[PDB]
Scaffold this active site. Structure first.
Site, PDB file in Angstrom:
ATOM      1  N   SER A  44      18.719 -10.338   3.680  1.00  0.00           N
ATOM      2  CA  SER A  44      19.342 -11.055   4.598  1.00  0.00           C
ATOM      3  C   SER A  44      18.731 -11.418   5.893  1.00  0.00           C
ATOM      4  CB  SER A  44      20.738 -10.048   4.896  1.00  0.00           C
ATOM      5  OG  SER A  44      21.613 -10.346   3.639  1.00  0.00           O
ATOM      6  N   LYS A  47      18.903 -14.873   7.119  1.00  0.00           N
ATOM      7  CA  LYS A  47      20.070 -15.723   7.639  1.00  0.00           C
ATOM      8  C   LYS A  47      19.843 -16.093   9.074  1.00  0.00           C
ATOM      9  CE  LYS A  47      23.082 -13.237   4.429  1.00  0.00           C
ATOM     10  NZ  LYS A  47      24.059 -12.197   4.248  1.00  0.00           N
ATOM     11  N   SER A 104      26.932 -10.343   7.973  1.00  0.00           N
ATOM     12  CA  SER A 104      26.194 -10.326   6.677  1.00  0.00           C
ATOM     13  C   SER A 104      26.837 -11.161   5.652  1.00  0.00           C
ATOM     14  CB  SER A 104      25.182  -9.222   6.256  1.00  0.00           C
ATOM     15  OG  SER A 104      24.005  -9.681   5.801  1.00  0.00           O
ATOM     16  N   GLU A 140      22.242 -17.404  -2.071  1.00  0.00           N
ATOM     17  CA  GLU A 140      22.825 -16.131  -2.328  1.00  0.00           C
ATOM     18  C   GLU A 140      23.575 -16.265  -3.661  1.00  0.00           C
ATOM     19  OE1 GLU A 140      21.995 -14.228   1.480  1.00  0.00           O
ATOM     20  OE2 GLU A 140      22.599 -13.526  -0.569  1.00  0.00           O
TER      21      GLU A 140
END
Ligand SMILES: *C(=O)C/C=N/[C@@H](C(=O)O)[C@](C)(Cn1ccnn1)[S-](=O)=O
Ligand SMILES: [Cl-]
EC number: 3.5.2.6
Length: 262
Positions: A44, A47, A104, A140
């Site tokens: 993550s 991101k 997240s 994802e």
């Protein structure tokens, strides 16, 4: 110093895994590096780059952050704490950026990816920053598999630290967009157990964590120590066992080691 190096090597040995660290101290343009040219699965932490790519696009598209994006049951993947609340309605790209960075949210990440043109477009953005190491290759949830030897969805600690410096402290983004990224990262709710847990309580941190397969446990941060110029710190960690548990304490320990004295 060899001192900090011996301490990071001892931490790595004790942890049983593979540790990657890059600290940039902007007071003197110095670095502390440990496995900093090896690749690690970003999970993550990627991101940040997706949100930054949206912010970059918004510099020439003043309605982009307000654009409404439908959230559908078919978008749910694993871990959608914010998006679940908005099924059958819309969220703006600004709201999705905040959700991706501060909670997240994985649906939010997928919407950022889709609205810049897919993983290869996030990678192309990285290349415009002079980052020729970063690669985003999947969406994802599969980008977090973190299989040893798999280069998909990886970068190096050195490359990510240099890129984070450019995004948060440099001028890769315009004035408004850089401030927005920093504000979002300072508002992260998921990082207190990672780098922050190795720093004094008074220091100000904007960070993004990640975790994934093989006990992969990551954090990237911009840090303002009390009364000092900012730091950039990347701490990546991964383990040999597919079902290893997360080790946020290892990231905290690495942060304490490399900021000792500052
Ligand atoms: C950011 O780091 C989001 C990470 N998600 C993964 C995790 O937290 O481990 C998830 C939830 C679990 N996973 C491990 C390996 N592949 N996935 S992913 O399903 O979102
Ligand atoms: Cl303290």
């Amino acid at each position: 110093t060899a001192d900090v190096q011996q301490k990071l090597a001892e931490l790595e040995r004790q942890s049983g895994g593979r540790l990657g660290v890059a600290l940039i101290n902007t007071a003197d343009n110095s670095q502390i590096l440990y496995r900093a040219d090896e690749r690690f699965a970003m999970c993550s932490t990627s991101k940040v780059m997706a949100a930054a790519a949206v912010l970059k696009k918004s510099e020439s598209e003043p309605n982009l952050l307000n654009q409404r994006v439908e959230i559908k049951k078919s978008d749910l993947v694993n871990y959608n704490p914010i998006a679940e609340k908005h099924v059958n309605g819309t969220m703006s790209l600004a709201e999705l950026s905040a959700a991706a960075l501060q909670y997240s949210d994985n649906v939010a990440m997928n919407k950022l990816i889709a609205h810049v043109g897919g993983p290869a477009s996030v990678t192309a953005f990285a290349r415009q920053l002079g980052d020729e190491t970063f690669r985003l290759d999947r969406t994802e949830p599969t980008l977090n598999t973190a299989i040893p030897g798999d280069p998909r969805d990886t970068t190096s600690p050195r490359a990510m630290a240099q890129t984070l410096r450019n995004l948060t402290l440099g001028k890769a983004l315009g004035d408004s967009q850089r401030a927005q990224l920093v504000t979002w990262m300072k508002g992260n709710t998921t990082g207190a157990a990672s780098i922050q847990a190795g720093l004094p309580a008074s220091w100000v941190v904007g960070d993004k964590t990640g975790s994934g397969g093989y006990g992969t446990t990551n954090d990237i941060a911009v840090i303002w120590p009390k009364d000092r110029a900012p730091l950039i710190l990347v701490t990546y960690f991964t383990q040999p066992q597919p079902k290893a548990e997360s080790r946020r304490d290892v990231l905290a320990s690495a942060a304490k080691i490399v900021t000792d004295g500052l």
